[PDB]
Symmetry: D2
Subunit: 280 residues, 4 copies
């Protein structure tokens, strides 16, 4: 059992919570880390910062990974030469697939745990074409392409999950930049992918619609997350605090053979908030 986790940058997000829970079932974890935060994440690892947070994880490997790039030929010269990518290799999608396959053979688990939008702070009406396409490229297409290259290094009857948010289905003002659009496309693509992957590969794919968690990404939005969290803890059917390991144990289930008959689905792990119409 080996899982590649694409999109972890610290211990405060869903990626880490998923890693933690998979470790409990003795799953081998490989981190794919965005080069802008790659070095600091490494430094904190060896300097034992995450030691309190790993309570012990089985981290097979930690690789540079940028889901903007499908192959080495896609890397633009500027990025190629950038201070933070300098200096790094094999971080495209095709490249990490190959690298992982060489080091470890075929894997059976894949987690898409990333999203990005340059103009998330703008509302949809005010988002540029460029910002909107960026959101879809990094948050949605990246999943499709992740699948395309990893299906060849995955066995049957492997499993894939991604993370989404209810703003795709119902209006959440402030979730801007085309992020709502990107989540809607990703939830749709999850179905279409589940069809092709199931038929041709006997591989499963689902997505988890998570509730609010105060992560790096969540703060990128101009107190929105604080309100989100506070509103959820007040109005959700379940009033417990939502933890990243709550999503993690659900991710672990979806990735395991116990969920062998579930595919193409959007599964809500949000203390039930999604079921509410009117505040209390």
């Amino acid at each position: 059992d080996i899982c590649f986790i694409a999109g972890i940058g610290d211990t405060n997000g869903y990626g880490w919570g998923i890693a933690k829970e998979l470790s409990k079932r003795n799953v081998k974890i490989i981190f794919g880390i965005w080069p802008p935060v790659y070095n600091i994440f490494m430094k904190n690892y060896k300097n034992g910062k995450f030691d309190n947070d790993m309570i012990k994880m089985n981290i097979l490997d930690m690789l540079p990974f940028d889901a903007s790039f499908d192959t080495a030929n896609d890397i633009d010269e500027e990025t190629k030469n950038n201070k933070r990518y300098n200096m790094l290799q094999n971080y495209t999608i095709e490249d990490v697939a190959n690298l992982i396959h060489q080091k470890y053979g075929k894997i059976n688990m894949l987690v898409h745990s990333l999203a990005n939008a340059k103009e998330v702070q703008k509302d949809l009406l005010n988002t540029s074409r460029k910002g909107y396409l960026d959101a879809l490229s990094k948050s949605s297409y990246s999943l499709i392409s992740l699948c395309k290259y990893f299906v060849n290094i995955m066995k049957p009857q492997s499993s894939i999950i991604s993370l989404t948010y209810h703003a795709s289905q119902k209006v959440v003002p402030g979730y801007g930049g085309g992020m709502s659009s990107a989540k809607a496309a990703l939830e749709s693509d999850t179905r279409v992918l589940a069809y092709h992957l199931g038929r041709n590969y006997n591989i499963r794919i689902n997505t988890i619609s998570a509730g609010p968690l105060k992560s790096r990404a969540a703060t990128a939005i101009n107190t929105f997350i604080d309100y989100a969290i506070e509103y959820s803890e007040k109005y959700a059917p379940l009033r417990q605090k939502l933890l990243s390991t709550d999503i993690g144990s659900v991710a672990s289930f979806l990735l395991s053979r116990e969920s062998r008959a579930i595919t193409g689905q959007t599964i809500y792990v949000d203390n039930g908030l999604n079921i509410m119409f009117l505040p209390d």
Copy 2:
């Protein structure tokens, strides 16, 4: 020590059984609630060892008890004289929803898992337009309200962070000609009630409730459904009662503590398709 009450088994050929089997792997103690008119037959078969092969898990299914259980009666007060006189029922007692909760609580204490696994529609063969008021309401009574009454009465005998599931079918959401008698209507109400119940039980007791929308299991038209499913579903493998079982087991465990009010599809992904390919 976890205990699960499974309401609605009649043989080892349905979802209830598949759910019992998977739960047993987690060392969950099982209590069966069985429709009185087939209770004695079931006990006989069980005694005659007909289920021995079905019970093997190198682990035996630990069946704590098997009780007569009728989802159409809420309390002793609701038993009509015609069933009181009735052959089968005459030699059985304490089979109303409240009576069974009291029995279980008395004999074994509080439980923490509840499975609603039962449906009945006396006119399931007639299409909706030709279903009588009597047939429709019977369908709703047995298949939908029974869930609410189960929750009403079993919540008092459940631990906090307990979990509840029922079984539903996609005919509630999309048209399946042949799934008649108001069974579609009953499933739609059940999925809606699952949300409303999730709010109440969640806020007032910290108890979760979800429903599993299952693909076809041979437990006529069922042969069509199964064939069509196996031809057109994203996943080619045969859908097993234990495929639903392992999902049920997870929803009933604390691994799913943040999931409630949901309809979870366990159907090889058939629900996602629009047109045959």
Copy 3:
């Protein structure tokens, strides 16, 4: 010459009226079906001119007839002796669903528009978990099965390409605490049945059926709903009974010939929101 039967009016303060008004603009002849216990009061008020202002369209609403109509009885056969004896009912006749279809057909011939605009739940004040089996099934009987029985009996007296609508509410799909007694369950069943009925009626009679999910109209918690709606809905204007009326008119016309089996939201867009802003 188009004729629409509107089942479920009691005053000029609800959706039924708003729908009658808008249809009148299209020169549709209106027949009202009125719950017997308020039939006489309604006739009196109508006679005493209490509705004259409400009827102005420089066009008068053309009310072809007003008949007693009870959605809980399918045929003369279903009338229980307690209602037979009953004060109000005693002096009225032919108010069962089949009886009214026969009357209308006899007096006026075939119609081509049908509106189901009625809901009743005797325990609407209790939350779902505390609703009795009796209260739940009453809700389903009056609010959901009544639609099926209406279609069953009125289809024989309708022209081809006729059209049918009912009224529903979003509590079926998302939790609205306070909308109790199984009204949420009833609405969920009604929206599902609308699809199943659309298939049967569409294939067998080329008749369409849809439902309108309406926002709140003051016709307690309703004051909350209306206030919340007017604060948080995408559209600020007040939701009028005639906002539902004009949508109903369109769904009942041939302009919507390719729309059937749908739940159409007329609620200022409130349904699309997740969190208050």
Copy 4:
């Protein structure tokens, strides 16, 4: 009553059916026409080809329009110089808005009736990043931007509609190139837009999920439409043939004041096919 129809190229699609139905209610129609097909469409108009099809429409104007371009500054040099754009002016989104406002003042109706995807023939898994982003840019973002520039030349209480397809919600193999993704994003964006447009502008926006129609675009897909049409006519609850004027009269209703309380909605005009699970 003036309506701008963005995305008509002949009389065989939904745009024309919508034009026809709006004319019946005495609405003034302005066509926005993709420059690749602009000249031939004009030529056929004056050469009376469409005369049989206009049975008489009130065509206020016919303008070159390319929804790929938000402003003149967005036009790339090659396109600017292309044989078919040569030669044409004011065809960006900002430009047609301005032009229409100068000629006619403010309008009250807008129809987004276009879609495009370079790789529609490929299935999702095999779509490139570039193809996928093209689909979203032309089919989805174009609506957002159309709204952004037209809201200023529209009165309250104006109305906007677009066209979508059920492949966003359920799997339709063969609807490739990210078109499924684009429709899912567009249905989501319709909600988010309905919120901002309703609150700030008292303007409505909805989308029509249409059934199959043998149009130019529909044939671009590698007999798929023929099967679609044939399957729908066999299995839809309503077995009448679906006409472009069936959508048109629904479009007319949504655009009119009769639908003043409907917004953010996906309305199915498809003889009811969407409600079916199992074939007959």
